[PDB]
Design an enzyme around this catalytic site. Sequence first.
Site, mmCIF file in Angstrom:
data_model
loop_
_atom_site.group_PDB
_atom_site.id
_atom_site.type_symbol
_atom_site.label_atom_id
_atom_site.label_comp_id
_atom_site.label_asym_id
_atom_site.label_seq_id
_atom_site.Cartn_x
_atom_site.Cartn_y
_atom_site.Cartn_z
ATOM 1 N N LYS A 46 0.804 -1.222 0.000
ATOM 2 C CA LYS A 46 0.000 0.000 0.000
ATOM 3 C C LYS A 46 0.841 1.278 0.000
ATOM 4 C CE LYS A 46 -1.958 -1.023 3.751
ATOM 5 N NZ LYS A 46 -1.292 -2.314 4.075
ATOM 6 N N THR A 48 4.024 1.720 -0.681
ATOM 7 C CA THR A 48 4.884 1.797 -1.856
ATOM 8 C C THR A 48 4.118 2.287 -3.079
ATOM 9 O OG1 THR A 48 6.340 0.014 -1.073
ATOM 10 C CG2 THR A 48 6.384 0.522 -3.424
ATOM 11 N N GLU A 164 -2.556 6.069 6.296
ATOM 12 C CA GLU A 164 -2.945 5.675 7.652
ATOM 13 C C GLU A 164 -2.937 6.803 8.690
ATOM 14 O OE1 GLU A 164 -2.270 1.768 8.864
ATOM 15 O OE2 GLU A 164 -1.060 1.197 7.126
#
Lengths: 265, 245
Positions: A46, A48, A164
């Site tokens: 994710k 990357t 996140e």
Amino acid sequence: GRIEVVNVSHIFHRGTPLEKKALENVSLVINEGECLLVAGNTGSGKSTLLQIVAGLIEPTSGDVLYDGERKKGYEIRRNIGIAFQYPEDQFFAERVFDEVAFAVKNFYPDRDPVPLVKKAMEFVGLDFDSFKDRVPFFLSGGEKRRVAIASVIVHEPDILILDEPLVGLDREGKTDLLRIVEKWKTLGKTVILISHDIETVINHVDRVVVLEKGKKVFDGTRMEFLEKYDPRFFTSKMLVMRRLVLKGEDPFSMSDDELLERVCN
Amino acid sequence: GSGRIVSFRYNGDYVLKDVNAEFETGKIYVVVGKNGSGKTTLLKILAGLLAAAGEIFLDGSPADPFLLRKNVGYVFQNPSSQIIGATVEEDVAFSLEIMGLDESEMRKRIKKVLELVGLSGLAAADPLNLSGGQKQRLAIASMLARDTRFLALDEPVSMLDPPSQREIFQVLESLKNEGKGIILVTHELEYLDDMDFILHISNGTIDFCGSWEEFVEREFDDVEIPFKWKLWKKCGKINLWEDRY
Ligand SMILES: Nc1ncnc2c1ncn2[C@@H]1O[C@H](COP(=O)(O)OP(=O)(O)O)[C@@H](O)[C@H]1O
Ligand SMILES: Nc1ncnc2c1ncn2[C@@H]1O[C@H](COP(=O)(O)OP(=O)(O)O)[C@@H](O)[C@H]1O
């Protein structure tokens, strides 16, 4: 404005015994003004993927099309703001002001950065006089997350990526930060979210892409996600949303209490 | 073995006043309360990392911070500020050197504890180059290896993926079944299926200690009630994480 990923793969350290295939032949489309959730376990690729889209990494294979055509690093980075999952990977300054003003002094070096920083900080709910001189190292996680965001929307990009951003936050702090997200997309700008907190984030997105061991194992809308994706490890709330969806209802934009009266009756 | 277990000010005001609580081995305690209500402070006191004024017992006997550190394992909210080692296995082995020393057992033990947290295969890795969630697994591992009767975990799995979060909670659920006392603050109550008592912190003290059933019926407004519990109230204890297969 519009993003197209076409069969990109990515390898870390080719040939050497510490060779790691982060991504494998993934492709997807992000329309202008779209709000996308990128989910998937730890190590699925994710972070990357979105780094490549933001122009911080040159993909080992494939290409990414920005409004139809390839571009180079510099061009991409001016229009794509990305907040990392660990904000200390962004920080380098000893004052909040200097941390935020950076992208302006790097892209638009003659603009008085002062009123820019002042409104980016205001956009995220940070009082200017209260925060401009504070040391980032000693901010709360919620405060650090705000500074991280303000420092990447300050040069007014068209795309915003949040890796996140709700980790370690309260139901309060999460709510207030999604409030900032809604604002962003009210300006008609596209925003990508990487998150595990689907049941909370899903009410704010349009599509959901899921990564797994480097591969895209799902792409679709949020309605499609609930109804089609393997529900074996959905949370309790996701299972209720899914129920309601399969009965042809619209669980999104509906309270947790309102969710419950429509099930187990 | 079995086990059983006030006020506090840092330096200005009193943050905890008149705290009455009781913890036994073989049970899981979850501490809730809004931000800056004292959860983290309360757990450090239990751990013996903060010295408080008042009366704390360990099996009847009075307990000084020291004696607490003897019997209460701790995981910080920030796992970085907890570990010092050259390798992963060095940060762990640290906690057992009072434990007899004895080595063939450490290397067998450290083996076990790394497996539980999912850091098996990274024994020789350098903690300075681990990810955030990896450090968390390491912090939990150096705590589990001390083999204390009580474990204090202040948001131990905040930066793990949902499956790893369940795996840790499930390790905690089996430690409880083996006579550990677990005191835990977490936002990830969704992934915890087994637990005994909820403690609510309000106004610098504990104004609640009961079952989740009693907690729901309570309707506190300063804290969130887990969605899972209301579902349990309306639909029953279905879809437990063990029964997903
Ligand atoms: N610089 C690097 N060198 C070697 N491996 C890497 C590097 N960066 C990422 N990886 C590996 O790539 C995989 C995907 O990681 P990442 O892109 O952070 O996805 P996610 O954020 O979803 O875990 C991981 O298994 C990680 O070990
Ligand atoms: N190192 C410290 N020095 C002074 N005050 C502190 C310190 N740590 C915490 N406090 C105060 O104690 C109160 C509760 O702290 P804490 O237990 O961290 O809150 P929470 O339970 O929300 O984690 C807060 O109001 C905070 O201002």
